[PDB]
């Protein structure tokens, strides 16, 4: 049953790509002040779950949902900017830059590991196809 | 239903998989949204493995046919 | 066109370049008395918006206007 490794590692690659994309989106908007609806940008993060249907022992990984990060919104005193609060408290995203950079590095490394898994699995499938010949 | 039918079904399945991978690759090269390079590359990998399986089955089948036709009656 | 990560990071680079340009133009005109018409120079600000192409999921940064 080496074919299931294709599904497992492909799901892992897709999930890590989504995680890296979300981390990069958070990082690129660390300095944002406004959203499309006027709301401040809220740092977002993916949720990882075991991609196993009920009764399946072990599977790959899947992104359940994207959730707003739990952290206080960064308050900035700029009661001159057109966007402000009642007391001039501009709300800026709660992005922790070090966390996002480390997340990007971790996602890249896990991605590369899954690529190696896929490569060696394909090599083994070819060798198995050359069983008796 | 029959052996020829099973072989035709296997060939159709392999060709359909290869065509699906090729179509997804062309869609990605087109720039259409939602198609990820990960899926393209994995599907091309799977199509290559399936093609190799079909080639091996053909090789053996031909070898067995040659062996049977070599029988002296 | 661009891959999603490429677009996001390139938009971030362009937005930061625009903000740096606004800051440099303000720092140059710190002592200007008049413009080309006879009105004082007004400090420019750049507003970052999130270019959420999908619904609330992700997106780079765009600049609506200065």
């Amino acid at each position: 049953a080496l074919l299931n490794i294709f599904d497992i590692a492909g799901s892992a690659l897709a999930a890590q790509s989504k995680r890296l994309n979300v981390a990069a989106s958070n990082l690129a908007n660390a300095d944002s002040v406004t959203g499309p609806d006027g709301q401040p940008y809220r740092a977002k993060q993916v949720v990882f779950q075991v991609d196993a249907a009920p009764g399946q022992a072990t599977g790959g990984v899947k992104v359940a949902s994207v959730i707003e990060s739990q952290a206080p919104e960064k308050l900035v005193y700029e009661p001159g900017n057109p966007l402000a609060d009642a007391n001039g408290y501009v709300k800026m995203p709660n992005v922790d830059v070090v966390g996002e950079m480390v997340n990007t590095m971790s996602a890249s490394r896990s991605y590369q590991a899954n690529i190696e898994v896929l490569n060696t699995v394909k090599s083994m499938m070819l060798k198995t196809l050359t069983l008796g010949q | 239903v029959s052996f020829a039918g099973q072989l035709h079904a296997a060939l159709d399945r392999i060709s359909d998989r290869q065509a699906a991978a090729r179509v997804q690759a062309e869609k990605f090269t087109l720039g259409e949204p939602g198609i990820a390079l990960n899926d393209v590359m994995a599907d091309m990998q799977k199509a290559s493995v399936s093609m190799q399986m079909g080639i091996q089955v053909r090789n053996k089948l031909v070898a067995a046919y040659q062996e049977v036709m070599s029988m002296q009656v | 066109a661009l891959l999603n990560i490429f677009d996001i990071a390139g938009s971030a680079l362009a937005a930061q370049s625009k903000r740096l340009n606004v800051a440099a133009s303000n720092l140059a005109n710190a002592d200007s008395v008049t413009g080309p018409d006879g009105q004082p120079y007004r400090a420019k600000q750049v507003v970052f918006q999130v270019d959420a192409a999908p619904g609330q999921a992700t997106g780079g940064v765009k600049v609506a206007s200065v």
């Binding site: 992104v63 | 259409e32 198609i35 | -």
Partner: peptide
């Protein structure tokens, strides 16, 4: 689904 992958073509078409 809701989130497109990093290695996907710009969601904006």
């Amino acid at each position: 689904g809701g989130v497109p992958g990093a290695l996907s073509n710009q969601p904006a078409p």
